């Protein structure tokens, strides 16, 4: 997160870190046994780390649970990043309390104008590299489909939306990928892609979760 603020410990209780020896991606806890993340985050050997604030210190609210199964979206295309979404089942159920909690799925899509909370342990510099230890947060609006498409001609599908600021300076970044975009208490987006970070006229591009709720629910029901 570039141009954000320190969230505060365990204030984003659905935020997870994906670990394969180091933090490499975010995700969101959507029930006690399932995590939603970006398909471009897929790899084997994932450990899900819940209840984190400082990813480099054991602080006392962590739960570390191995993935038992990963499911990339059937239609994921790694070249276009269309359908950049994946489900991870945990080997055991997480224990849910105030500091570790699931996030609601949307029953309807969000619209342009709605403010959202984006969070992660990704890079904090736009023209630089500095990775935080503690979770960072940014409040940002959804942008119109037209300004999204004008920012990225020929690249925005119906499964993507833009959020952030056209002026630059505030955005998600490398290492935030897979993490949440939550609007009025609903998981509306997944950190997916963008040209650089926090650059002028190059807002964040997010997976449009509302398009996937049917796939998410049926997948959970059968696995
Ligand atoms: Ca920790």
Description of the structure:
- With 223 residues, this protein is mainly beta.
- It has 2 domains: 1-12 and 103-210, Thrombin, subunit H, CATH 2.40.10; 13-102 and 211-223, Trypsin-like serine proteases (Thrombin, subunit H, Beta Barrel).
- The protein has 2 helices and 13 strands.
- The chain has helices spanning 145-151, 213-221; strands spanning 5-6, 15-19, 23-31, 34-37, 47-50, 63-72, 86-90, 115-120, 136-141, 160-163, 180-183, 186-193, 204-208.
- The strands form 2 sheets. Strands 1-9-8-11-12-13-10 form a 7-stranded antiparallel beta sheet.
- 44% of the residues are buried.
- The protein binds calcium ion.
- Calcium ion (CA) binds next to loops.
What's this entry about, in short?
This protein has 223 residues and is mainly β. It is built from 2 helices and 13 strands, in the order βββββββββαββββα. The chain folds into 2 domains: 1-12 and 103-210, Trypsin-like serine proteases (Thrombin, subunit H), CATH 2.40.10; 13-102 and 211-223, Thrombin, subunit H.
